[PDB]
């Protein structure tokens, strides 16, 4: 850091090893003031690339309060996402023959859903729905089960394009179009979340507002999933309270999405309150959907801890419930990922090999 020439790599990287968001904000401010375009701009993108949540946000907060506006925009990353979108549009590659042989492999089983998802994976970020629209029209005979996966496909093709994809998905208003096929609305909310992935703030706000003002039947699944996707790691009070209300109301049908959204909003926070709430609700309730969503939540509640996760998972993955075992090991695995943590690998392989419990 103290080398006379402010070379990009060392000062971008050592500061995040030492966890100095204030120091990197200060150096970014000095670069902005001196208006060294290359140094400031490249160091800001390198901070964005190498840093993570709770770090980039802290640095941008301390930077906001000559190129300050540019640094704020590029740390927000909307320009980087736009570059990724335009590259996907340009160098996007599609296979019509594969679309057709997947349509041939379409059968009465879940395989037709598989074909739609594969075609949309190939057509991710195309901003053009003719082949996929025709495929969905051809497969628009088995609904009330495949709407969720079809709207997932529509979300992945039009992800991060709220300028027009928002309207393209809002063209599917559920109430008038199909009251009987109740997954219409859930798929609408789910595609809204998937499309507005990597988008927060106002996205989080209008997701949570329509989730407050709506039914609790099917919309809540996709709504909570999209809300967590938009507020990943944020753990802001309003979405946290909505998710806690949904969880503790015992609405089991949506408790899965509620737990998934809890995990997303407490992504990496290592919130002891959150983990204790999740565990207690686990013993309180006995629904499989609740257990799986809560398993997701406990899975991504924390990562990179190496100080509390070991004891926490020794307590939780040992617990009575196989879902608790699976979620606790999820937590320890993604919390000791990045290094060969001997104790974490020890607990992981031991629970792999000793107990006969299939989960």
């Amino acid at each position: 850091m103290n080398l006379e020439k402010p070379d990009f790599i060392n000062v971008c990287q050592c500061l995040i090893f030492l966890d100095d968001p204030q120091a990197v904000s200060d150096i970014l401010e000095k670069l902005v003031k001196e208006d060294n375009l290359l140094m400031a701009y490249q160091i800001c993108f390198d901070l964005y690339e190498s840093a993570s949540q709770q770090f980039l946000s802290s640095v941008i907060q301390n930077l906001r309060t000559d190129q300050t506006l540019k640094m704020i925009k590029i740390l927000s990353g909307e320009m980087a996402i736009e570059l990724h979108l335009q590259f996907l549009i340009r160098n996007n590659n599609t296979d019509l023959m594969i679309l057709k042989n997947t349509k041939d492999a379409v059968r009465n089983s879940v395989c037709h859903t598989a074909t739609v998802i594969a075609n949309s994976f190939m057509h991710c970020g195309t901003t053009s729905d003719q082949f996929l629209r025709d495929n969905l029209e051809w497969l628009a005979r088995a609904t009330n089960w495949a709407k969720f996966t079809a709207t997932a496909s529509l979300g992945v093709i039009h992800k991060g394009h709220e300028k027009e994809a928002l309207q393209l998905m809002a063209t599917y208003l559920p109430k008038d179009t199909s009251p009987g096929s109740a997954y219409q609305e859930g798929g609408g909310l789910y595609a809204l979340g998937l499309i507005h992935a990597n988008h927060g703030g106002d996205i989080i706000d209008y997701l949570l507002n329509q989730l407050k003002n709506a039914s609790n039947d099917i919309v809540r699944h996709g709504g909570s999933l999209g809300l967590g996707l938009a507020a990943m790691g944020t753990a802001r009070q309003d979405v946290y309270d909505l998710l806690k209300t949904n969880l503790y109301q015992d609405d089991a049908v949506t408790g899965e999405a509620a737990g998934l959204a809890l995990g997303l909003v407490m992504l990496g926070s290592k919130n002891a309150q959150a983990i204790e709430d999740m565990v207690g609700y686990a013993q309180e309730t006995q629904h499989e959907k609740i257990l799986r969503g809560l398993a997701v939540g406990i899975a991504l509640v924390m990562y990179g801890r190496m100080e509390e996760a070991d004891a926490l998972i020794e307590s939780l993955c040992r617990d009575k419930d196989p879902i608790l075992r699976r979620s606790g090991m999820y937590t320890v695995a993604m919390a000791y990922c990045g290094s060969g943590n001997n104790k974490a690998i020890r607990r992981l392989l031991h629970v792999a090999v000793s107990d006969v419990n299939d989960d």
């Binding site: 060969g340 001997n342 690998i345 020890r346 392989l349 031991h350 090999v353 000793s354």
Partner: peptide
């Protein structure tokens, strides 16, 4: 370089030897 490379490789291999041995019982 190779010093800590071999240190970590030995740590992981000695761990996995014991862990996989734990299944003999």
């Amino acid at each position: 370089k190779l010093q800590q490379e071999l240190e970590f490789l030995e740590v992981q291999e000695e761990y996995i030897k014991d862990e996989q041995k734990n299944l003999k019982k």
